[PDB]
Amino acid sequence: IPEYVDWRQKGAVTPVKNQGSCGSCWAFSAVVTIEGIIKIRTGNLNEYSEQELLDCDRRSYGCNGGYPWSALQLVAQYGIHYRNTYPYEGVQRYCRSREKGPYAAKTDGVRQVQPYNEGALLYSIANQPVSVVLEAAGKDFQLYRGGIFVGPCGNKVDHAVAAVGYGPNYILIKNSWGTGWGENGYIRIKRGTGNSYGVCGLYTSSFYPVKN
Ligand SMILES: *[C@@H](O)[C@H](Cc1ccccc1)NC(=O)[C@@H](NC(=O)[C@@H](NC(=O)N[C@H](Cc1ccc(O)cc1)C(=O)O)[C@@H]1CCN=C(N)N1)C(C)C
């Protein structure tokens, strides 16, 4: 795998979103990986519905948090609508998949990256955008304005984001806190510290969709 990966450079990343006060990060994280793999497989970049996952993933707890892997399982088992047809409201409502016609995209499964393994995550990122979790509760992460982020932070993961690239010293992350946060909505998180958790627990729980 190469020294630099940036899926934005290959037109596989849609504009930065803002999840608002709703604990829907898990749905935003999942959708970034779907938008990525559909572009890589079909050559078309589309936006897909975070709201649909928020409403329809019965394993997750709507705006009270959820599971990127369960969201990705749902897209593999059923599918997902375009964001345009099922737009984001920042509140959990009834699952309205049936009322919005046939699904726009479908995947063939979900895979976990070997956890607590930097090389395993970089290998997956080289192939496609990956759903990752980290500790975002800390003020340092909340007030991040740019540069390579080293913390401070603990490993108490509480927030799902998407790894869309890496460099020699960092992993490139798409956050769902709008374009005003960090580097136009992105964070470069320090890698290669030798801490198996990753910086802010970045290696705790990572999933990517499978599509043939
Ligand atoms: C992002 O907007 C939200 C914010 C939030 C966090 C906690 C409570 C409310 C809102 N963050 C999340 O959705 C996070 N989700 C969780 O913390 C998640 N737990 C896990 O991801 N861990 C599981 C463990 C597990 C696996 C399978 C079953 O059946 C049970 C448990 C894992 O290791 O995969 C849950 C979601 C519901 N509430 C809490 N507290 N935790 C982030 C995605 C990590």
Write out the two tokens for 24.
């829907």
Whats the size of the chain, residue-wise?
A: 212
Catalytic site includes residue 159 = yes
Smallest CA separation from ligand 1 atom 18, residue: 66
Technique used to solve these coordinates? X-ray
Mutate to test the pocket of ligand 1, among 19, 51, 67, 88 (most ligand atoms within 8 A of CB): 67
CATH number of the structural domain spanning residue 203 = 3.90.70.10
Residue 158 Cβ inside 6 Å of ligand 1? The answer reads yes
Catalytic residue among 22, 153, 159, 200: 159
How many C-beta atoms surround the C-beta of residue 169 within 10 A? Answer: 13
How many C-beta atoms surround the C-beta of residue 45 within 10 A? Answer: 15
CB contact at 8 A, 47 and 81: no
For residues 59 and 56, give the distance between their C-alpha atoms in angstroms, rounded to a whole number.
9
For residues 202 and 111, give the distance between their C-alpha atoms in angstroms, rounded to a whole number.
17
Smallest CA separation from ligand 1 atom 31, residue: 67
Domain total for the chain?
1
Smallest CA separation from ligand 1 atom 22, residue: 67
For residues 60 and 35, give the distance between their C-alpha atoms in angstroms, rounded to a whole number.
21
Catalytic residue among 56, 81, 175, 200: 175
What is residue 161's three-state secondary structure?
Answer: strand
For residues 164 and 95, give the distance between their C-alpha atoms in angstroms, rounded to a whole number.
29
For residues 170 and 78, give the distance between their C-alpha atoms in angstroms, rounded to a whole number.
35
Q: What angle do CA 68, 156, 190 make, to 5 degrees?
A: 85
What is residue 91's three-state secondary structure?
Answer: coil
- Report the first-to-last Cα separation within the chain, whole angstroms: 21
**Closest among 58, 55, 36, 57 to 47, alpha carbons compared:** 36
The residue assigned the tokens 């938008």 is 35
Write out the two tokens for 119.
């090389």
For residues 110 and 90, give the distance between their C-alpha atoms in angstroms, rounded to a whole number.
25
Q: Please give the C-alpha separations between residue 103 and each of 90, 126, 161, 164, 183, in angstroms, as whole numbers.
A: 21, 28, 24, 25, 33
For residues 119 and 191, give the distance between their C-alpha atoms in angstroms, rounded to a whole number.
10
Give the atom of ligand 1 at the shortest distance from the alpha carbon of 19. 2
Q: Which residues pair with residue 155 across a beta bridge? A: none
Catalytic residue among 22, 25, 153, 200: 25
Residues 6+ apart with CB under 8 A from 22: 54, 62, 63, 90, 91, 92
How many helices (H) and strands (E) the chain has is answered by 5, 8
φ and ψ of 18, to 5 deg: -125, 115
What is residue 65's three-state secondary structure?
Answer: coil
CB contact at 8 A, 131 and 72: yes
Tell me the residue range of the domain where 61 lies.
1-212
CB contact at 8 A, 129 and 208: yes
For residues 13 and 5, give the distance between their C-alpha atoms in angstroms, rounded to a whole number.
13
Residues 6+ apart with CB under 8 A from 112: 69, 205, 206, 207
CB contact at 8 A, 112 and 207: yes
DSSP 112: E
How many C-beta atoms surround the C-beta of residue 84 within 10 A? Answer: 11
Give the atom of ligand 1 at the shortest distance from the alpha carbon of 133. 44
Is 25 annotated in some ligand binding site? Answer: yes
Rg (CA), the chain: 16
User: Strand 186-190 relative to strand 148-149: parallel, antiparallel, unpaired?
Assistant: parallel
Residues 6+ apart with CB under 8 A from 147: 188
For residues 79 and 127, give the distance between their C-alpha atoms in angstroms, rounded to a whole number.
22
Q: Please give the C-alpha separations between residue 196 and each of 127, 163, 193, 204, in angstroms, as whole numbers.
A: 22, 17, 8, 9
